[PDB]
Design an enzyme around this catalytic site. Structure first.
Site, PDB file in Angstrom:
ATOM      1  N   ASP A  90      51.815  53.567 -17.442  1.00 31.17           N
ATOM      2  CA  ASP A  90      51.434  54.523 -16.424  1.00 31.17           C
ATOM      3  C   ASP A  90      50.012  54.155 -16.006  1.00 31.17           C
ATOM      4  O   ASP A  90      49.078  54.306 -16.789  1.00 31.17           O
ATOM      5  CB  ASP A  90      51.554  55.946 -17.010  1.00 31.17           C
ATOM      6  CG  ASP A  90      51.331  57.107 -16.034  1.00 31.17           C
ATOM      7  OD1 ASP A  90      50.826  56.870 -14.926  1.00 31.17           O
ATOM      8  OD2 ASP A  90      51.706  58.234 -16.368  1.00 31.17           O
TER       9      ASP A  90
ATOM     10  N   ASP B  73      49.693  57.299  -8.396  1.00 34.09           N
ATOM     11  CA  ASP B  73      50.044  57.609  -9.778  1.00 34.09           C
ATOM     12  C   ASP B  73      51.506  57.213  -9.901  1.00 34.09           C
ATOM     13  O   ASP B  73      52.375  57.824  -9.282  1.00 34.09           O
ATOM     14  CB  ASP B  73      49.819  59.111 -10.065  1.00 34.09           C
ATOM     15  CG  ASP B  73      50.002  59.546 -11.517  1.00 34.09           C
ATOM     16  OD1 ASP B  73      50.335  58.679 -12.364  1.00 34.09           O
ATOM     17  OD2 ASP B  73      49.908  60.779 -11.792  1.00 34.09           O
TER      18      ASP B  73
ATOM     19  N   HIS C 156      52.664  66.942 -10.318  1.00 32.23           N
ATOM     20  CA  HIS C 156      51.439  67.654  -9.916  1.00 32.23           C
ATOM     21  C   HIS C 156      50.962  67.250  -8.561  1.00 32.23           C
ATOM     22  O   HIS C 156      51.180  66.116  -8.160  1.00 32.23           O
ATOM     23  CB  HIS C 156      50.298  67.350 -10.938  1.00 32.23           C
ATOM     24  CG  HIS C 156      50.169  65.886 -11.281  1.00 32.23           C
ATOM     25  ND1 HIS C 156      49.256  65.071 -10.625  1.00 32.23           N
ATOM     26  CD2 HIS C 156      50.872  65.139 -12.163  1.00 32.23           C
ATOM     27  CE1 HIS C 156      49.399  63.859 -11.168  1.00 32.23           C
ATOM     28  NE2 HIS C 156      50.366  63.851 -12.092  1.00 32.23           N
TER      29      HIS C 156
ATOM     30  N   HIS D 233      44.792  65.845 -10.795  1.00 34.67           N
ATOM     31  CA  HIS D 233      45.523  67.135 -10.814  1.00 34.67           C
ATOM     32  C   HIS D 233      44.797  68.037  -9.814  1.00 34.67           C
ATOM     33  O   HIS D 233      43.681  68.493 -10.102  1.00 34.67           O
ATOM     34  CB  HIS D 233      45.446  67.786 -12.216  1.00 34.67           C
ATOM     35  CG  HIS D 233      46.494  67.338 -13.181  1.00 34.67           C
ATOM     36  ND1 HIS D 233      47.554  68.159 -13.520  1.00 34.67           N
ATOM     37  CD2 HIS D 233      46.619  66.166 -13.843  1.00 34.67           C
ATOM     38  CE1 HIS D 233      48.286  67.466 -14.379  1.00 34.67           C
ATOM     39  NE2 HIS D 233      47.771  66.262 -14.599  1.00 34.67           N
TER      40      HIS D 233
ATOM     41  N   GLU E  67      57.075  63.265 -11.351  1.00 34.28           N
ATOM     42  CA  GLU E  67      57.327  62.568 -12.598  1.00 34.28           C
ATOM     43  C   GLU E  67      58.206  63.363 -13.502  1.00 34.28           C
ATOM     44  O   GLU E  67      58.114  64.590 -13.550  1.00 34.28           O
ATOM     45  CB  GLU E  67      56.046  62.211 -13.331  1.00 34.28           C
ATOM     46  CG  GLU E  67      55.094  63.350 -13.653  1.00 34.28           C
ATOM     47  CD  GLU E  67      53.823  62.819 -14.278  1.00 34.28           C
ATOM     48  OE1 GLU E  67      53.904  61.861 -15.086  1.00 34.28           O
ATOM     49  OE2 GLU E  67      52.735  63.293 -13.886  1.00 34.28           O
TER      50      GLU E  67
ATOM     51  N   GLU F 260      57.759  57.767 -12.654  1.00 32.88           N
ATOM     52  CA  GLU F 260      56.908  58.549 -11.757  1.00 32.88           C
ATOM     53  C   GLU F 260      56.621  57.802 -10.468  1.00 32.88           C
ATOM     54  O   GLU F 260      56.362  56.599 -10.506  1.00 32.88           O
ATOM     55  CB  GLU F 260      55.573  58.805 -12.484  1.00 32.88           C
ATOM     56  CG  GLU F 260      54.464  59.437 -11.661  1.00 32.88           C
ATOM     57  CD  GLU F 260      53.254  59.735 -12.520  1.00 32.88           C
ATOM     58  OE1 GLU F 260      52.968  58.945 -13.444  1.00 32.88           O
ATOM     59  OE2 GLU F 260      52.677  60.827 -12.353  1.00 32.88           O
TER      60      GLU F 260
HETATM   61  C1  LIG Z   1      43.608  67.992 -15.401  1.00 32.39           C
HETATM   62  C2  LIG Z   1      44.741  68.247 -16.363  1.00 32.39           C
HETATM   63  C3  LIG Z   1      45.169  69.542 -16.642  1.00 32.39           C
HETATM   64  C4  LIG Z   1      46.217  69.779 -17.517  1.00 32.39           C
HETATM   65  C5  LIG Z   1      46.871  68.719 -18.120  1.00 32.39           C
HETATM   66  C6  LIG Z   1      46.472  67.415 -17.865  1.00 32.39           C
HETATM   67  C7  LIG Z   1      45.404  67.186 -16.998  1.00 32.39           C
HETATM   68  O1  LIG Z   1      44.870  65.953 -16.723  1.00 32.39           O
HETATM   69  C8  LIG Z   1      45.476  64.765 -17.254  1.00 32.39           C
HETATM   70  C9  LIG Z   1      44.769  63.600 -16.586  1.00 32.39           C
HETATM   71  C10 LIG Z   1      43.455  63.191 -17.252  1.00 32.39           C
HETATM   72  C11 LIG Z   1      43.858  62.098 -18.228  1.00 32.39           C
HETATM   73  C12 LIG Z   1      44.976  61.361 -17.526  1.00 32.39           C
HETATM   74  N1  LIG Z   1      45.559  62.358 -16.617  1.00 32.39           N
HETATM   75  C13 LIG Z   1      46.704  62.132 -15.865  1.00 32.39           C
HETATM   76  N2  LIG Z   1      47.173  63.188 -15.153  1.00 32.39           N
HETATM   77  C14 LIG Z   1      48.319  63.015 -14.474  1.00 32.39           C
HETATM   78  N3  LIG Z   1      49.069  61.919 -14.366  1.00 32.39           N
HETATM   79  C15 LIG Z   1      48.556  60.880 -15.065  1.00 32.39           C
HETATM   80  N4  LIG Z   1      49.060  59.616 -15.192  1.00 32.39           N
HETATM   81  C16 LIG Z   1      48.243  58.964 -16.042  1.00 32.39           C
HETATM   82  N5  LIG Z   1      47.224  59.685 -16.464  1.00 32.39           N
HETATM   83  C17 LIG Z   1      47.414  60.913 -15.845  1.00 32.39           C
HETATM   84 MN   LIG Z   2      50.918  61.987 -13.072  1.00 33.49          MN
HETATM   85 MN   LIG Z   3      51.002  58.864 -14.292  1.00 34.12          MN
END
Ligand SMILES: Cc1ccccc1OC[C@H]1CCCN1c1ncnc2nc[nH]c12
Ligand SMILES: [Mn+2]
Ligand SMILES: [Mn+2]
Length: 359
Positions: free
Chosen positions: A136, A147, A216, A224, A247, A342
């Site tokens: 990912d 993403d 998201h 996010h 996803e 995703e």
């Molecule tokens: C802000 C937030 C609130 C609640 C839960 C998770 C989240 O943040 C998680 C983010 C930061 C690290 C990596 N994050 C990713 N978030 C989405 N899709 C991703 N694909 C690869 N890393 C991804």
């Molecule tokens: Mn994601």
């Molecule tokens: Mn991702």
């Protein structure tokens, strides 16, 4: 002016007039009036340089992932995989500070670990033949993030689990649209994923969506943006001009993830403003983060790459102050298998573009 083998030519040099290829364009789930509406065409053309940035990021993502699929093999360490993938991504996106680069660390989560695992320095983990690995990774141009993720396996025993999750993700992509309820996207995904039964080493399972993992909305430099797309049942709507990561995660375990293992992923809290810091190592690390990542997620390897050392206490201080949030690996039960697919979609005024899918 043609892409090399292995790829090294920036996507920007492959398209000399600055117009990048569109992803798959779809009609909304009649919504056909949108593709010919003069006002929707004008409203779409107004955001064209935005869609163009996502498309450049998406072409880099497609070329990196075809390259990864050509060499990822058991025997490689997880560090080797992440470094080889990121070396390519940095070159294709033409990394340039906060204007173009990697949108978040390369996840390569294994087996019962579903997400947010990337190795830290010194991690000796080696990819195995029986491993189920979720690659990912993300690219961005001007904070317009792609993403996109897929699952890698070598043993055919997981083929039906991967088919279940891919079908569930494709159902989500199809169900998504302007004014569509997010919970309606979630219910369609669950129905599809749970129609699959799989047999792995003589045990049968009905594939379970991971109930506390989700799709998201995506915002500028904000992975996010505030809206979540559920992957189980249990009524907020999607709006025109929004961008979503659709996803799904399937599991042979409990279908619930919990924090486990050493944390690698961190991200500055988007809602926390300027906080003066006098503590010198903590102040320096925050400046490093502000200069290199802003509100984009980063990992400890990326701090090491920038020449930072002895930063763990400074990083813990930033987490305790609420300036940075840690995102530890998320795992289902020991012995379970998880898969993920995703894509990023643009909810354009005229059509739905699965920008990360080539067409
Ligand atoms: C802000 C937030 C609130 C609640 C839960 C998770 C989240 O943040 C998680 C983010 C930061 C690290 C990596 N994050 C990713 N978030 C989405 N899709 C991703 N694909 C690869 N890393 C991804
Ligand atoms: Mn994601
Ligand atoms: Mn991702």
């Amino acid at each position: 002016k043609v892409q090399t083998d292995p790829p090294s030519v920036p996507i920007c040099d492959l398209y000399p007039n600055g117009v990048f290829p569109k992803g798959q364009e779809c009609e909304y789930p009649t919504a056909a009036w949108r593709t010919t509406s003069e006002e929707k065409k004008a409203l779409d053309q107004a955001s064209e340089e935005i869609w163009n940035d996502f498309r450049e990021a998406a072409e880099a993502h497609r070329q990196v992932r075809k390259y990864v699929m050509s060499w990822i093999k058991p025997g490689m360490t997880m560090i080797e995989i992440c470094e080889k993938l990121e070396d390519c991504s940095r070159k294709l996106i033409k990394e340039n500070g906060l204007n173009a680069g990697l949108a978040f660390p390369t996840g390569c989560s294994l087996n019962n670990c579903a997400a947010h695992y990337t190795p830290n320095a010194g991690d000796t983990t080696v990819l195995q033949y029986d491993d189920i690995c979720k690659i990912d990774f993300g690219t961005h141009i001007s904070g317009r993030i792609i993403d996109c993720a897929f699952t890698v396996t070598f043993n055919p025993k997981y083929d039906t689990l991967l088919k279940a999750v891919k079908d569930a993700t494709n159902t989500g992509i199809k169900c998504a649209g302007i004014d569509v309820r997010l919970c309606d996207v979630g219910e369609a995904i669950q129905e599809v994923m749970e129609s699959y039964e799989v047999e792995i080493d003589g045990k049968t399972y009905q594939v379970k969506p991971i109930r506390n993992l989700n799709g998201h909305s995506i915002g500028q430099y904000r992975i996010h943006a505030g809206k979540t797309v559920p992957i189980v049942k249990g009524a907020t709507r999607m709006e025109e001009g929004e961008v979503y990561a659709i996803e799904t995660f399937g599991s042979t375990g409990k279908g619930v993830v919990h924090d486990d293992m050493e944390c690698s992923h961190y991200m500055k809290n988007f809602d926390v403003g300027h906080v003066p810091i006098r503590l010198p190592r903590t102040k320096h690390l925050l400046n490093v983060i502000n200069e290199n990542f802003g509100t984009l997620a980063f990992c400890r390897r990326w701090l090491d790459r920038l020449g930072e050392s002895k930063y763990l206490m400074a990083l813990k201080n930033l987490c305790d102050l609420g300036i940075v949030d840690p995102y530890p690996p998320l795992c289902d039960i020991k012995g379970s298998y998880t898969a993920q697919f995703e894509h990023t979609i643009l909810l354009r005024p005229t059509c739905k573009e699965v920008v990360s899918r080539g067409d």
